[PDB]
Structures are given as C-alpha cells and as structure tokens.
Paper text:
SETD3 is an essential host factor for the replication of a variety of enteroviruses that specifically interacts with viral protease 2A. SETD3 functions as an actin-specific histidine N-methyltransferase, and comprises an N-terminal SET domain and a C-terminal Rubisco large subunit methyltransferase (LSMT) like domain. The N- and C-terminal domains of SETD3 form a V-shaped central cleft, within which the actin substrate is recognized and methylated at residue H7318,19.
To reveal the structural basis for the SETD3-2A interaction, we carried out crystallization for in vitro-assembled SETD3-2A complexes, and only SETD3 1−498 mixed with EV71 2A yielded protein crystals, and we tested ~1,000 crystals for X-ray diffraction. Whereas most diffracted X-rays to more than 6 Å, the best crystal diffracted to 3.5 Å resolution. It belonged to the P21 space group, and the structure was solved by molecular replacement using PDB 3W95and 6MBKas templates. There were four copies of the SETD3-2A complex in the asymmetric unit. However, only chains B and F in one copy had relatively clear electron density, hence they were used for structural analyses (left). We clearly identified electron density for the zinc chelated by the zinc finger of 2A even though zinc ions were not supplemented during purification. We validated the presence of zinc in the structure by calculating polder maps at the 2A zinc finger, which revealed positive difference densities for zinc ion. Comparing the two independently determined SETD3-2A complex structures showed that while the conformation of each component was highly similar (RMSD between the crystal and EM structures of EV71 2A was 0.49 Å, and that between SETD3 structures was 0.64 Å), their relative positions were slightly shifted, which contributes to the increased overall RMSD to 1.20 Å. We then aligned the crystal and EM structures with respect to SETD3, and identified a rotation between SETD3 and 2A. Structural variation between the crystal and EM structures reflects a degree of flexibility in the SETD3-2A interaction.
Residue numbers in the entry:
A (entry chain B): 21 to 498
B (entry chain F): 6 to 146
The structure:
C-alpha cells in the first residue's frame, strides 16, 4: 500500500476495456494509455527484485544447478554477441543433426509447475490465469524471482533486465511505425498487457489466496512488463507430465540460443522426459550456436520476439479482402465459401518469397472475378469435384481472362497500399544507412521498410504475371 | 503415443491406417478428412480442445519426439497422390513446417486447451494435420 496505484490502475482497466476508437484515432488512444502507465511507472520503484551483480556473473551458477540435475553443459559457452546479445558459442566442433542440448523437465518452468507452486491457489480461482498460460507463466517467473529459496533462481538471475519488445519502446520509437499494419498489432500488445496489469494488481490486493504471495508487497509495471516480455520472447510449448495436452515452458539454457533461418530442430522427448535440440548446421569451434525460433513474420518478431531478422524467408504482411455485399453474384459465391473453407472475409498474407500470393489467397481472388458461367462449372459436372480441388493450383488456371483481372486488382490494391504508408521505400533505405537510430528504432523502421519491401515483390510479380497471361490471348492455345 | 485420440467411448484415427475392427465398430468416416472414428468400451483420457490455437506440438514418429509447429487454419488443400490416397479434395488440413515421413501419420497435435488434430499428410518439408476440434459431437455422452 499505497492505493494511489490501485486508483491509477482502476482507470487503466476501464480505459483499456474500451473497444477500438477507429483507425487514425488509435494513436490518440495509445498515448492516452501510455501516459497513465508512465505516471504509474514513474511512481513505482521499477523492478521489485533486482540482482546485486551483473547478468553474466550468474551464468556459471546456472551451469552447476543445471549439471546437478542432468543438463548438457559442455560444447558451448556464454558470449555477449554484438548482433544478437548473449548467446551460445561452440567450444568444439558440432556437426549437423548432432544432439548437443538436453534439459530435464524438472528444470523447466511450466504452467503445471505454476499450478503446483504458490500461484496455484490463485490459479485455482482466477479464470484469466487459468486461461492464458503466457501470463500464468509470467507470474510463476515473478513469484520465484521474489523467492530467495527458489530452485529456479539460477535461471531467473541469468534473465535480462530489459527487452526490445514494443512494451519498452518510446513514443518517438513507436512514432516511426504509423500507417503500417504492425502498429495496429503493436497497440494490441500494449493495450492487453496494460489491461492485464490493472486487473492483476487489484486481485493480488483483494484475493485471500494472494495474501501469502510476495507480490502483495510489490507488483510494479516494470515487473509485469519484464515478466510477460520474458515469456513471449523465450517460451516453447511442451507436453505436460500426463502428455494429455501441451503447456508453455521456459526451457533454461536452450533459450539463450539466438536465431538464424532454417528448420525447427528443437524437440521434447517425453520418454526421457527432457528437451533435446539437435544442431541445425555445422557449428565450428568459436561459432555461435543458433536455433530456429519458428516461421514467424517480422511483425511477430518485433512484437513477440523483440528483434528484426534480415533475410527472413517467412516475412509476410496481412491483407483484408472480402466479398462486398454489393455483389449481384453473392448467393452463387456464398456456396463455395462453406465448401472451399473460405470465410466471407478474413486476413490473408502477401509473402516475401516466391510466390507472393498463396494458394489460399488465389483460391479467394480467383472466385473474386469469375462470371456466372464459371461458377456453375465448379458446382455441376463430373469435373466439379476435381476442379474445386485444383482451385489453388497455378498450373490449373480456372480461366485465362480471370488471371489478368486478379493481377490487375492486386496491381490497384498493392499500389494503393504503398500510398497508405507515411514514407516511401526509397526514403527508408537511406535512413538506416545514414541515421543513428536506437536499437529499437532500427527494428521498427526496418519492419516498415520490410512491409513495403514485401509489396514491391508482390507488385512486380503481379505485373510479371499479368503481362504473362496477357500474352496468352494471341496463341489461342487449348 | 497410440497414434489415435481416445476420448469417452470413441476412438479417432486416420482413415487409411484403421484396423478392420475399427470398421467393425464404425461410428463415422470421411475420406475428405483422412479421419475415422470408432466406438470403444473404455473411457479414453484425451480431452478435445475447442480452441482456435494455431501453435501446437506434434509427435514425429520417425524422430520419436514432439515438435512445436505453427499451422494454418483448417482449409481444403491440394494433396498430391501417395500410396494411400490418389489426389482428391482434402479439407480441414492444417499445414505447418516440420519433419513428417511415412509412418509419422498418427502424431497427436495439441493446443494448451487439449488435442488439436492428428497427422494426415506430409511431404515437401510440410506436415498436414486433420482437424478434429470441429466435431463437438465427439464428447462425453
Ligand atoms: N536475430 C536476432 N537479432 C537480435 N536479437 C535476437 C535475434 N534472435 C534472438 N534474439 C534475442 O533473443 C532473445 C530471446 S532469448 C535468446 C538469448 C539472448 N542472447 C539473451 O541474452 O536472452 C530475444 O528477445 C532477442 O533479444
């Protein structure tokens, strides 16, 4: 206590409990919420529990505690890399597929561990903790952070103090992401996070089962902001002890490995009850041990992982497309959507790597320029079962003329989407080479560049595909 | 890891790997889903998730390990012919990147709220999961 914070949080829940004010008005609602948070944050002591030394000084303690329970601690070391921060560096030669990490479940922080810890009585009654493990795991991290007699202390002491999540960004830092699609998701991160902090700061003060928790003495925003940021950036799903379902988990040691493109090599072996990572490629002595974090977009990387990966082959931007209710052909097209698994409208993605379109967006865009005759060609006939199946195959064009329409539509839409951005692709390239941006600012701007960089490959491909199908009218081939 | 979902008095498995006894105790089938459901006498201890989770962990039989995957929504996707099914419309197929080779059909995919699906297709560095969450009728009686 004080409860000024409780009054300051009371407002955050309600304001953050509001629906979206609109587009263009969200920034005003964003800064409304940050100001109130900044008031609370500047009225609180920051991280409730702070470690006396520096981060790296606690890495040897991690290895011993891990080695006491059977974790691989040889073949790598803790090195502060410039480009990715702390990571693992091979102390010997590691071949491809060579298993070099194994971590028993006893060391991992899992929601099943949360339900068995001091948070368990609170989890028993709270439905939000019961529902969202990413939060429930964050509180498990904070509960044991404020517990000196904790099994997982050597792990928490290695965890960072700050992260590059948009939760840590400044208003100028988020100011660069305006007119983009990611910022609409960056807001959702801040809003939901803030809202959860307001809900939970109350419940700890009011719930009896929280009386024994050490968070009742101190539960700041910088605590919670660090907590969920810790979870969203280094969480991995593993099965529970019963194996009946999965659960989120903070896998120690394995999470310090940074990211490079490739395939997911990290698996959990329930038979051995432990996590196993095989080498993605050949790691010479002194080379950093990377892992593959997943096929996530650079938007998800900034928002959920906290960095921008160059040369990501899985970068993509969303695009909202739908059948306008002003269509004379709705009812005939309303049949396909239930049998082709396509919603009436939804978010589709334009992909960086070839092809920019998906087989499912093409399965939406093809039907978005058909005539009445071609709508009964898929519905009535001995080829109606084979043709709806070959709706995503580019080598099965439904009709030659429809092709140019679909690339024309995208030519119009994509060029429009470039206009929507506050800057141009040419201006963004110069700003990274010529300006001195914050570590976080560099992340956000490269994304705003990336988003436009994705479309530029979608525009010319649409242009290349449009000219191609336009050439087809001359030969009159079958 | 039995290669099948055991809930209540029901047994769910890929249609192309089912034993004849499954057809002897047939409850429901679909060639367009690679999904077969059979009646059992015991009470399976698997919970059907009714979530829209899109990040889950699946068992890779060839690697004998569980793997987290980000898979797309239940959708009708082209599957080229294999030794089991010639190419034909296949719906409710969540696709993700991972290792899935012949014999890996049967890996149980799960979300934080329970089971999501079961491996149906593979190839080209992708793994296909046949969705089950939709079948609410698949619950306790
Ligand atoms: N390509 C990349 N560039 C920069 N940072 C990266 C990265 N891939 C992963 N990271 C870092 O990895 C963090 C999750 S844990 C990875 C270990 C990290 N060295 C550490 O000291 O914690 C991310 O939040 C991000 O800071």
């Amino acid at each position: 206590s004080p409860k000024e914070i409780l009054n300051l949080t009371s407002e955050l829940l309600q304001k953050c409990s509001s629906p979206a004010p609109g587009p263009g008005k969200e920034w005003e609602e964003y800064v409304q919420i940050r100001t109130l948070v900044e008031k609370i944050r500047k009225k609180q002591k920051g991280l409730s529990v702070t470690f006396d030394g520096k981060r790296e000084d606690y890495f040897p303690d991690l290895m011993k505690w891990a080695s006491e329970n059977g974790a691989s601690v040889e073949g790598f070391e803790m090195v502060n890399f410039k480009e990715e921060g702390f990571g693992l560096r091979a102390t010997r030669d590691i071949k491809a597929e060579e298993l070099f990490l194994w971590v028993p479940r006893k060391l991992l922080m899992t929601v099943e561990s949360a339900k068995n810890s001091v948070l368990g009585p609170l989890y028993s009654q709270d439905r939000i903790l019961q529902a969202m493990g990413n939060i429930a795991l964050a509180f498990h991290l904070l509960c044991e952070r404020a517990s000196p007699n904790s099994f997982w202390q050597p792990y928490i002491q290695t965890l960072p103090s700050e992260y590059d999540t948009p939760l840590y960004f400044e208003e100028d830092e988020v100011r660069y992401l305006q007119s983009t699609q990611a910022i609409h998701d960056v807001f959702s991160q801040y809003k939901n996070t803030a809202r959860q902090y307001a809900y939970f700061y109350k419940v700890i003060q009011t719930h009896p089962h929280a009386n024994k928790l050490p968070l009742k003495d101190s539960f700041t925003y910088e605590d919670y902001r660090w907590a969920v940021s810790s979870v969203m950036t280094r969480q991995n799903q593993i099965p529970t002890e019963d194996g009946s379902r999965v659960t989120l988990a903070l896998i120690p040691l394995w999470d310090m490995c940074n990211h490079t493109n490739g395939l997911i090599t990290t698996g959990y072996n329930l038979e051995d009850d432990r996590c196993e990572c095989v080498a993605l490629q050949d790691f010479r002595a002194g080379e950093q041990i990377y892992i593959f974090y997943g096929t996530r977009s650079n938007a998800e990387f900034v928002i959920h992982s906290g960095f921008f990966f160059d040369n990501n082959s899985h970068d993509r931007v969303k695009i909202k497309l739908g059948v306008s209710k002003s269509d004379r052909l709705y009812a005939m097209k309303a049949e396909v959507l239930a049998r082709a698994g396509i919603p009436t409208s939804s978010v589709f993605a334009l992909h960086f790597t070839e092809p920019p379109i998906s087989a499912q967006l093409l399965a939406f865009l093809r039907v978005f320029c058909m005539t009445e005759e071609e709508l009964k060609e898929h519905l009535l006939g001995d080829s109606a079962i084979d043709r709806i199946f070959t709706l995503g195959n580019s080598e099965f064009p439904v009709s030659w003329d429809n092709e140019v329409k679909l690339w024309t539509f995208l030519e119009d839409r994509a060029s429009l989407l470039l206009k929507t951005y506050k800057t141009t692709i040419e201006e963004d390239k110069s700003v990274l080479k010529n300006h001195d941006l914050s570590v976080r600012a560099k992340m956000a701007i490269k994304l705003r560049l990336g988003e436009k960089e994705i479309l530029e490959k979608a525009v010319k491909s649409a242009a290349v595909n449009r000219e191609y199908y336009r050439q087809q009218m001359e030969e009159k081939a079958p | 890891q039995s290669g099948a979902i055991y809930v209540g008095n029901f047994r769910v498995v890929n249609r192309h790997l089912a034993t004849h006894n499954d057809w002897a105790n047939l409850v429901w089938e679909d060639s367009s889903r690679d999904l077969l459901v059979s009646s059992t006498t015991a009470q399976g201890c698997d919970t059907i998730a009714r979530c829209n989770c899109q990040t889950g962990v699946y068992y890779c039989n060839s690697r004998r390990k569980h793997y987290p995957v980000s898979f797309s929504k239940p959708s009708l996707i082209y599957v080229e012919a294999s030794e089991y099914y010639p190419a034909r419309y296949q719906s409710h197929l969540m696709l993700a990147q991972g290792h899935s080779e012949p014999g890996d059909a049967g890996g149980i995919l799960r979300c934080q709220h329970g089971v999501v699906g079961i491996v149906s297709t593979g190839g080209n560095g992708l793994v296909g999961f046949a969705d089950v969450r939709d079948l609410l009728w698949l619950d306790e009686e």
